[PDB]
Amino acid sequence: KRLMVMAGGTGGHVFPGLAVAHHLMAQGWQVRWLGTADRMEADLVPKHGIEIDFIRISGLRGKGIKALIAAPLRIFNAWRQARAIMKAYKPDVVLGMGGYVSGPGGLAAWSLGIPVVLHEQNGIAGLTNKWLAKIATKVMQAFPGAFPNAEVVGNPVRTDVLALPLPQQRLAGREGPVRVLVVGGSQGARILNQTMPQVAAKLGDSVTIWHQSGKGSQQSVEQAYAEAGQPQHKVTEFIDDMAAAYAWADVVVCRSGALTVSEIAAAGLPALFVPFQHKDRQQYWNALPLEKAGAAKIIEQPQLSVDAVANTLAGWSRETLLTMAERARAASIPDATERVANEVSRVARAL
Amino acid sequence: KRLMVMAGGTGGHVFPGLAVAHHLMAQGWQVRWLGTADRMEADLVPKHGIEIDFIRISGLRGKGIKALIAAPLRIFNAWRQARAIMKAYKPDVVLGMGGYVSGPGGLAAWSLGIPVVLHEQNGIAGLTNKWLAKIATKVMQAFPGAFPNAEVVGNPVRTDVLALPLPQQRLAGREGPVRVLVVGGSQGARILNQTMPQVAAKLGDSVTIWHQSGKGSQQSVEQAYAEAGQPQHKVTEFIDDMAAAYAWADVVVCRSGALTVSEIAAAGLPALFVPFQHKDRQQYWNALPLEKAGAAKIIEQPQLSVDAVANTLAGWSRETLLTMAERARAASIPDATERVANEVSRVARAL
Structure with a gap:
């Protein structure tokens, strides 16, 4: 055929x-x-x-x-x-x-x-x-x-992400700082590279971050975190094994391209989506389904700020995150x- | 004069x-x-x-x-x-x-x-x-x-380290995975670069690591951690702001050159010393003083191995680490x- x-x-x-x-x-x-x-x-x-x-x-x-x-x-x-x-x-x-x-x-x-x-x-x-x-x-x-x-x-969705254990199993007995994975893509997300370091200063010991800066931005983000007084956070230019990073994370902060939203749902991970602004608001509409299911929170450009991100993450306990993760998997x-x-x-x- | x-x-x-x-x-x-x-x-x-x-x-x-x-x-x-x-x-x-x-x-x-x-x-x-x-x-x-x-x-001792807050202040209210700082110096400690990734595998979520690999070894150690299934650990070629790293850490794994031992004491930090082997056992004698005070543990390469290191770290509780920390500071x-x-x-x- x-x-x-x-x-x-x-x-x-x-x-x-x-x-x-x-x-x-x-x-x-x-x-x-x-x-x-x-x-x-x-x-x-x-x-x-x-x-x-x-x-x-x-x-x-x-x-x-x-x-x-x-x-x-x-x-x-x-x-x-x-x-x-x-x-x-x-x-x-x-x-x-x-x-x-x-x-x-x-x-x-x-x-x-x-x-x-x-x-x-x-x-x-x-x-x-x-x-x-x-x-x-x-x-x-x-x-x-x-x-x-x-x-x-x-x-x-990528097979390695689909192969990930269900949320309850992956998050079982997990204690300690909420693991925040910041994903900017190959080119990186300018607003995230600028916002997260300040968010880290506000949240301190309550979170542990793995920030993916994008091509050529590894050095400046690493410096931003040190200047914010939280040098211990991990910063990499890229992430070749997204499945491994998703398995580690408790919550993801990223844009909401269509394939990305589907990947997140399949991974069974709570997300704080920062839709790329556009008169069409395509990415906003891509993330809405997960937000409606109570698996994520959307913060469009008109409301994005250090305090908005920090307050949003601070309000999510491990119990809430487990529920959000399950709702994500369910919407997958x-x-x-x-x-x-x-x-x-x-x-x-x-x- | x-x-x-x-x-x-x-x-x-x-x-x-x-x-x-x-x-x-x-x-x-x-x-x-x-x-x-x-x-x-x-x-x-x-x-x-x-x-x-x-x-x-x-x-x-x-x-x-x-x-x-x-x-x-x-x-x-x-x-x-x-x-x-x-x-x-x-x-x-x-x-x-x-x-x-x-x-x-x-x-x-x-x-x-x-x-x-x-x-x-x-x-x-x-x-x-x-x-x-x-x-x-x-x-x-x-x-x-x-x-x-x-x-x-x-x-x-460098003054930025000397000014670090006392152990009680640093560890007050601190919870979560034990923060392990692995220091190999400008040239790195080959054995630490080879041993810690495997130790990470055994300890999983119980520890969070910041590994300083040395010149030209960042990528090989980073890859080692990923292969050990713990890609989230932070790996840097060098650590310029040692004071900031010591502020963050709960325990340090490193060689025991004289200046390093005094620096660890000033920082008021527990340490797992891995003395450089030599007939005079210089580094062994530099560390012995802190161990005798009950502020550290010495492991010479003869009896140094993955299980030996992992077992030592796994055996130190936060309450224990606070004690060792205070002991370390007192001997400064x-x-x-x-x-x-x-x-x-x-x-x-x-x-």
């Missing part, structure tokens, strides 16, 4: 799409990618041993369906390019993980009678997925709320990858 | 000598150094703005004072070199901090009628100091036992520099 995946690196849709592709390739499936030449998937997908076909959508990015149809020549051309690719590759089903390229791609598949399956990783539907869903044979979403009735299947969906792959398989079967 | 300090090729002798030098220079005293052009003092002393005269003694092969004294022409020449140096500088007194170069220097001062003051930093007198004591006007030792009746004045002398400085002043005035 042939599967064509539409998922660009922008918006981070390529990673979950890659998870599904690899899962199906292990089932004998042939997978081909549909993306754009000057985007991240152009370099990453080939490194995964997967072939990729390109189309041009220049000037069409950021346009919703009404805006696309208002550009007759360009939308028709991208649509014709995708149609040619699909007539040649002849996929049995097309999977759209979100992203602008999936618009013309989805329209091409649909016009050719190829079933379209979509997956939305965020708490709020992306511009393209929102309208593409109307010609989709099957629509899935990671969290509830992005779409009114789409089956909730979660996002793919461990087999998102298999579920999506199975639905893509069922739809290709025309069942 | 002119003083000539004679201290050999080891920080053990040189560092305390520099403290006494600076202390007196800030009081109008003129100070000059006597050492060897090939040893570390040749580079360090000039960096402190102090002039340094050298004694050239070739063909020793590392034997030291015992060899020099067994070579008639060599001892005669070294003694005359020192006399020429003292005839030109005309010091009112000379301070010997140990080391073979102080031997010809002391003989020279004695032959010119210049009083000789000695300071022994270790639990066992160095051979040069032992013989020199036979012509010295005043002998002082850091710990009792080096010499039978020499005044005990201790060793110079905070005015070593001022004390030796005063004795030097008294002798120079022929009091």
Whole structure:
């Protein structure tokens, strides 16, 4: 069976799409990618041993369906390019993980009678997925709320995180300072590198921190902690083994990208989410589900301060943290990858 | 007031000598150094703005004072070199901090009628100091036992450590995992770098570690802890602010060079001393004083192992550690520099 995946690196849709592709390739499936030449998937997908076909959508990015149809020549051309690719590759089903390229791609598949399956990783539907869903044979979403009735299947999560012991077991008999894990990602989180050292000064002996500063920020954060009078805290540029860090932690302080929220839920860890601000507030919507379940606390930019973070952490006892961890695990969906792959398989079967 | 300090090729002798030098220079005293052009003092002393005269003694092969004294022409020449140096500088007194170069220097001062003051930093007198004591006007030792009746004045301690709050204040209300500070010095202690990660594995959550690995060993030790399943421990190449680390720690695992032992006592901290093995067992004798006071535990490499260290730490309760801490502080002398400085002043005035 042939599967064509539409998922660009922008918006981070390529990673979950890659998870599904690899899962199906292990089932004998042939997978081909549909993306754009000057985007991240152009370099990453080939490194995964997967072939990729390109189309041009220049000037069409950021346009919703009404805006696309208002550009007759360009939308028709991208649509014709995708149609040619699909007539040649002849996929049995097309999977759209979100992203602008999936618009013309989805329209091409649909016009050719190829079933379209979509997956939305965020708490709020992306511009393209929102309208593409109307010609989709099957629509899935990671969290509830992005779409009114789409089956909730979660996002793919790293196997090592999924393998972690349940919260009660992991936290059993644990006493001593609340272990705070600060995660900034490869590039690091500027606001966290600046805020946490002062938070440490306010909380003193009540917490033990492992702060991941991001590339080239190890030295300055390490210095900030010493200046705050809490030099004993651990600061690393990166964390290669997130599963090991999650197993150690009592609570995590980090941004709320969609995959990150799913990973946190699967790890069964309480979190204090600092959503990246944006008029769309995508990350805010990604974290909301966990906050609603009482597994995390969201502090958007408009309320972020040293005192807000410090007071928030200080208010969480070990009993409260255990409850939050369990609620996180409960809000988790461990087999998102298999579920999506199975639905893509069922739809290709025309069942 | 002119003083000539004679201290050999080891920080053990040189560092305390520099403290006494600076202390007196800030009081109008003129100070000059006597050492060897090939040893570390040749580079360090000039960096402190102090002039340094050298004694050239070739063909020793590392034997030291015992060899020099067994070579008639060599001892005669070294003694005359020192006399020429003292005839030109005309010091009112000379301070010997140990080391073979102080031997010809002391003989020279004695032959010119210049009083000789000695300071022994270790639990066992160095051979040069032992013989020199036979012509010295005043002998002082850091710990009792080096010499039978020499005044005990201790060793110079960095003042940021001397100012650390008392054990009761530091440990008041402190709970949680025992904080273990592993110190290997600028070059690191290979055995500690290899032993502590394994010890961490055995003690798990009962301890929190801050391991100072030494130059170029940060990454290998960091990796060792991760492989031992305890990646959360802090690992730093160096520790500049030792006072801050000592403030944080509950117990210290380190070598027992003389200055280190005095520093541990001043910090009022329990310690697991791992003496550097040698025929003279110098470090063993430096530590023995604290252990006898019930402020530390000594473990020589022969009976040193993962289980040996882990078992020792696991056997110390917080109540016990507080006791040891108080014992350590009680066995401390905070005015070593001022004390030796005063004795030097008294002798120079022929009091």
